[PDB]
Symmetry: C4
Subunit: 224 residues, 4 copies
């Protein structure tokens, strides 16, 4: 266990990153002409949410299933009041995120035309002021898992860890609208690592910090 | 509590309005040319249904999850026979609806081309006679939550408040067909408040009143 | 009760027929030019499956939720061996189906261009030999509800009557491919009643009879 | 029973193959011109996942619902350590797969234009090196059912065999991207049997063997 959840965690994210990119890039590949699809990226949404549940994150992990950066942090902070010690799973997550973005490459990059661009760069058209969207989309999932963990004795009766996989699935469909491609950090860090140009602004990282911070203050406005 | 459910309620709708508009307007934004999508508004459907469930409307609220105007009223009326006192949650809802439409603006409006048109105006092509559709789509959700609250001991066994989020999700896909954009009141009031032209006819508000009234009379045709 | 389930049943189908047609016709309505969509009819699928569940078919009805013609019959036959008396719900269903197709008209027909064509006529391109598809799609739902009613003590644990609403939702997406528009009888009878041309061949009705007959013989190949 | 699960198994796959092909080919059929759709094959995903659940694979079968080749094997191997005897269900599956691809033909082939091409041949553009994708998509389902069977006492509470039907539904949407059409063996064997050209490379069969082998080694990295 002194390393197990971490490896298992690194394992998940890894495939998730390959899953997402597979779907995102997949478009226009043969020696044909442009087509451009919008229902593809919405597919990325679901897929990513499924790979998460497919983890069997029961014993193999801890009460929280797969957790992307911003989320990872968001939960451990609101879950830790009396004290402030639980960064391990965070470090674990980021690490696993890095490797995930390492394996992503593969044949995809070899067979692509000069200009692939694995991910966004300036998302749509808006100066460093159009970062409000991603902020709201971040408290969604953050709040989805928060709510899911809190309310219990009087909610439903049991279903399956798809709940989050579908909610994050939609936040994605809302964020990837035309600007803000790359909700959480991970997905974008590994994008700017290989075949990049650097000018990520990590604007998307400064978002969730305020967002996840906002969804934590809002959830405290309930009980204790 | 002498204000809590109201704030919590105002809170929900708020984000929901930003969620919906985000998805609806999101289309054609860059300095590119027309494209026009129809699978986008269907996305609005789901998204809106998710933000509702994401509320954890257990203790934080009362047995009914988020409730849009027409619905809000529809339930409290059929739930209240012996007497007629339970308008508070209604006032609460409308209020929260107003603020929701206030925050909607944001960067969206600043970066849009002169003619945005946040929402419908005369929905498709039909005089003040083409309001039957929205009426039927309104008793759907109204009846979804009504049925969900009534039948219990012999129904299923427990799932999650997505049920309504998917049913309303489809009513939307049926209403937003080409005419009647803006099922419930809320979404349209806040639309005609900022950057408008006034000629909403609130036709959509005169609908649900008859619709929700119809689904209440039809549900009485069962037990008591 | 000497009429209740029947009225309640007539009630359901009614709205379902209006729901479906609303979605099917909805396309290309304004004074614009052609566009033709294929993701719309797939919407019809889900919608129809939802209106079914929205029935609260517990006490108000009997163990089988809404049931379209071919299905209606299919269940009562396999459910009745020792004897052969349970046609009442069948007559009920067809009747309710007729009224459903009566109200369908409305504004839709008034504002449409000469050539609406509420439904199929010769579905795609194939003589009276291309009826195998609809046959297979019919045993799907028929078998969905059959299986759902049989296996119990060792299956899941309880969910919601969406199961059928999604399975029929897909059979539809498979049938309405390009030929065989109008899975069960109902939907097509009411189509050829108003603004028709008569040449339905009811081929779709001769299908399910063999189909539902086939799925009944196949389910007997299990226990007893 | 000395033949029952096998017939029942042959039965399932059969319809599944007809289901899938129905959806895949369905596009561009009338005497009209090209259109080419991408949201159709994603429909194949779900449909296939539904026909599986529709099996009522409780007593009629064994703990594993329908199981396609690669999967069939993948489970029986990880389920059998102490010994190595449980190939019967495997032989059964492949057999049923063969007949499934026999009935697939039908009217479809008679009314199609010379060049139908029931399935892929060289999937997209990539030498015998672009087989990594299908490998990853294979451990998905393989791992979905593996995880679903393992973790129990602390997971959810009961739902329905759609879980796999939706996960495989997405793996499909990820694989059928543009290359690797035909996830598991079955679907492709029966494709190269009727109206073929032979040059399948079964590359897709050499994949899952490594994939399913990989997902078995990864799941052992947990408990025992």
């Amino acid at each position: 266990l002194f390393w197990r959840a971490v490896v298992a965690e690194f394992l998940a994210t890894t495939l998730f990153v390959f899953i997402s990119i597979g779907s995102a890039l997949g478009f226009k590949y043969p020696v044909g002409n442009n087509q451009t699809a919008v229902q593809d990226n919405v597919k990325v949404s679901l897929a990513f949410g499924l790979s998460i549940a497919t983890l069997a994150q029961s014993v193999g992990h801890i009460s929280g299933a797969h957790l992307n950066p911003a989320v990872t942090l968001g939960l451990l902070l609101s879950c830790q009041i009396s004290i402030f010690r639980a960064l391990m799973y965070i470090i674990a997550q980021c690490v696993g995120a890095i490797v995930a973005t390492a394996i992503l490459s593969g044949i995809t990059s070899s067979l692509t035309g000069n200009s692939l661009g694995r991910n966004d760069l300036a998302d749509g058209v808006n100066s460093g002021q159009g970062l409000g969207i991603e902020i709201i989309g971040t408290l969604q999932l953050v709040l989805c898992v928060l709510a899911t963990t809190d309310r219990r004795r009087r909610d439903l009766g049991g279903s399956a860890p798809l709940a989050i996989g579908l909610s994050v699935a939609l936040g994605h469909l809302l964020a990837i609208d035309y600007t803000g491609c790359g909700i959480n950090p991970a997905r974008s860090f590994g994008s700017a690592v290989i075949t990049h140009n650097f000018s990520n602004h990590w604007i998307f990282w400064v978002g969730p910090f305020i967002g996840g911070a906002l969804a934590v203050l809002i959830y405290d406005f309930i009980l204790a």
